[PDB]
Each structure stands twice: as C-alpha cells, then as structure tokens.
Amino acid sequence: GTDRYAPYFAYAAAQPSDEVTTVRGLSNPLIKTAPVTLPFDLGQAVADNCLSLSGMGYYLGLGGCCPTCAAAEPRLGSDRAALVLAYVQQLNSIYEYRVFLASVAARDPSERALEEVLAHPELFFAYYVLRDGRDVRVLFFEDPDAGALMMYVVFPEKSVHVHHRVLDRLLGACAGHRIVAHVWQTMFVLVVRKKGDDVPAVSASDIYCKMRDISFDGELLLEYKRLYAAFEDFRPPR
Amino acid sequence: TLVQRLKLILSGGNLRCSDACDPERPPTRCVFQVHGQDGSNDTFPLEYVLRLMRSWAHVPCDPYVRVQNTGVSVLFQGFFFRPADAPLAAITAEHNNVILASTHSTGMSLSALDDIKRAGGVDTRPLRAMMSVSCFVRMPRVQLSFRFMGPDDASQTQRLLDRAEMRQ
Ligand SMILES: [Cl-]
Ligand SMILES: [Zn+2]
C-alpha cells in the first residue's frame, strides 16, 4: 500500500497556521473544460458551468477560468429577487418582444394558438433569460411524447457560448421544463419541453387585439416560415 | 478533537460544523456533521478530510463522507468506514457533476476515490492533486461537483513536504 501522507499529517497537527494555508492553497482546478456530446441535458450543468458549441466541439467549462464568461462578467454581475420578479412583470407586457410573438404570428396567427403559448409562461421566461446574455429565434411545436407544446431555441451563429450565470438563470426560471442542447442542419438548438407557480392571469384576447395593431418585420416572418419548414422532420428524442 | 481540526480546515469557508474518537477502536457511527445553508457556494475539502481520518486511525480503515440534500441545507456526514448500503458517486475525474434532489444523497470513500484518481491519470504525489466538493445550493436541489484541485504554487508545496520530512 501507501502511507506517504503520514509525515505531513504529523506536522499539520503541530502547525495549524500551515494547515489553513495548505487547504486554502488547493484552489487551482486541474480540469477547466471537459468535452460533452449532443443531445446534452443542461440539467447536468452546475451553477458555474458554461456551455460552448462550435466546429471545435462541445464543451462544459468552468466560468471562473473561461475568457468568454470573464468578458460578460461586469455586465451581468443582477439579483434573483428582482430577476424572478422581472420576467413575471414582463409577462404582462409583450409588445417589445417582436421575436417571440413573430414565431406565433408566422406559424398560427389565431387567438387559440396564442392561448396555448401563454398557457406555458416558462417558455417566455426561457426566451427572456437567453435574450439578455442575443439574436435567438423561437419555434413552437407539439410534444408527441407528452397536449403540451415544446419550444426550440435556434441560435444564429455557427459558434455558441451560454454564460454560467445565464444557464443558472435559465434552469432556475424553467423548473418543470427539461432543456436539452441539440444540433439540426448545422443549427444549434435548445429544446425546452415539460418533464412531469406565481404567474399572472394572461389575457389572451387583449394581446390578440394588440397583435393586430403591431406591424411585424416581413423579412422576420418569412425567416420563421423557412425555419419552421427546416425543423419539421427534426424528431428530438425523449 | 477531530471536530477542532475540521472547524480549522473549514474556517476559510462558510460551512457550519456540529460539536469523542478512539484511535485504537474507531466508531462505525457518524463522526461529524457539516452544514451548508441555502444560497452558499462554499467548497468542501473531501480528499483532505478523508486522508486525515486515515492518519487518525491506527487500525486499517476506509474513511467515507456522505453528502445529502436535507431539503433546506447540504449535509456532510463523516465516517471511518462506509456503512452498508451507503451511496458512492459513479463519477470520473473529468465528469464529476452530481445533482441531488430533496432527501437524495451521494457519497465518497477513500478507496473509491483512489480508483477514480488512478483511472484519470491524476498525480498521486501528496497535496499535488486533491479532490474537493464544490457545492451550490439551488433550492429545491443541491448541485455537487467532485473536482481535483492543485496548488497555485507547487514549489511551495514541495518545500512544505520537506519541512514535514525534516521533523521525523
Ligand atoms: Cl429534448
Ligand atoms: Zn464560459
């Protein structure tokens, strides 16, 4: 066997001031980033974990050692008490959020489709969190392995980096929804679906009235039509 | 006596410790209880306390620490022997994340830790690569990560080992 630690522990009992500095000194993590494979459940990522998706591969790295995380750190350095209350208050007013509503407008512009979207407020919370930390596109489809609907969060760039604080907020706001990272036709997508709450009584008729007054960008609605066409034969696993 | 040392080891962090052990006859029962309240992000020096328990005993043992989600805080139960049925994290050195739901628990014994250390090609030289538990209390869940930590300056650690070798 091995007893190589025995001379140190005899010394550590005699020198307490050295024991404090030795324990505190063990701060540098040996593994700063580890490879992952898609489909990847984001629920496997802890509070300081960041997700990186690229042609270089898929990685679950430590935020404290990550340069992409460090750059965004002064901008989103924001309390949960006001964060939880923020997307709850912003659920009442959906006018500025053109990207979210345009997806509903392009797919099915009826009040019955808007009734079903507003029935799952956690999906707007997912979009709100991912918007802050930017140019994402949402797609609503029916869950064939659950009368509930699932959301696809399509990323615009060939390179993707989800901040450790951003996915901490994302998982927290969507407790009751499973978030899995996928790749479909060179596009990185996050599938937000029900796995198994203080939310306002959403008036579907009032937002539907506002939708008629709102003038959407034509190029964004056709983009959604093309994106919905591309994600039809996706078939995400359970 | 061991609680005095454990409180000193954890003095740097914000982990509460609860207040006799015979070196010739070690107890099968729980030796220590380390608590971590909601919101906290403190680190537990797992490998260090497990190896400290091995040096404390003069009779062959396999020290074990159980990590539980009490549904309010994180619980770290200390043992000189892994109790029958006690859980062990199936983690590797690279893949070390464990998410604990309310009332659920995981654990780590020195022997199982040594197997992980050797399988991951990690350095066995004293205090060069030490496993520590990084815990994030995100209610109702307890997020754990069994990461290997090294010193910021290895030249300082090698000199400390010489000081221990000198006094022998
Ligand atoms: Cl999925
Ligand atoms: Zn990062």
Author numbering:
A (entry chain A): 24 to 100, 102 to 157, 160 to 172, 174 to 223, 229 to 270
B (entry chain B): 4 to 22, 26 to 174
Article passage:
Although nucleo-cytoplasmic transport is typically mediated through nuclear pore complexes, herpesvirus capsids exit the nucleus via a unique vesicular pathway.
To produce high-quality diffracting crystals of the PrV NEC, a pUL31 construct (amino acids [aa] 26–271) lacking the nuclear localization signal was co-expressed in E. coli, together with the conserved region of pUL34 (aa 1–179). Data were collected for a selenomethionine derivative of the complex, the electron density map was calculated from experimental phasing, and the structure was refined to a 2.9 Å resolution. The crystal structure of the heterodimer displays an elongated shape of ∼50 Å in width and ∼100 Å in length, with the putative membrane-distal end being composed of pUL31 and the membrane-proximal part being composed mainly of pUL34. Each protein of the heterodimer is, overall, globular, with the exception of helices α1 and α2 of pUL31, which extend around pUL34. pUL34 has a β sandwich fold comprising nine β strands. pUL31 has a complex topology, with 11 helices and nine β strands. Notably, a C3H zinc finger (ZNF) motif is present, with three cysteines contributed by CR1 and a histidine by CR3. The four residues coordinating the Zn2+ ion (C73, C89, C92, and H188) belong to the most conserved residues in pUL31. The extensive buried surface area on both proteins (∼1,850 Å2, corresponding to ∼13%, for pUL31; and ∼1,750 Å2, corresponding to 18%, for pUL34) is likely the cause of the observed high stability of the complex.
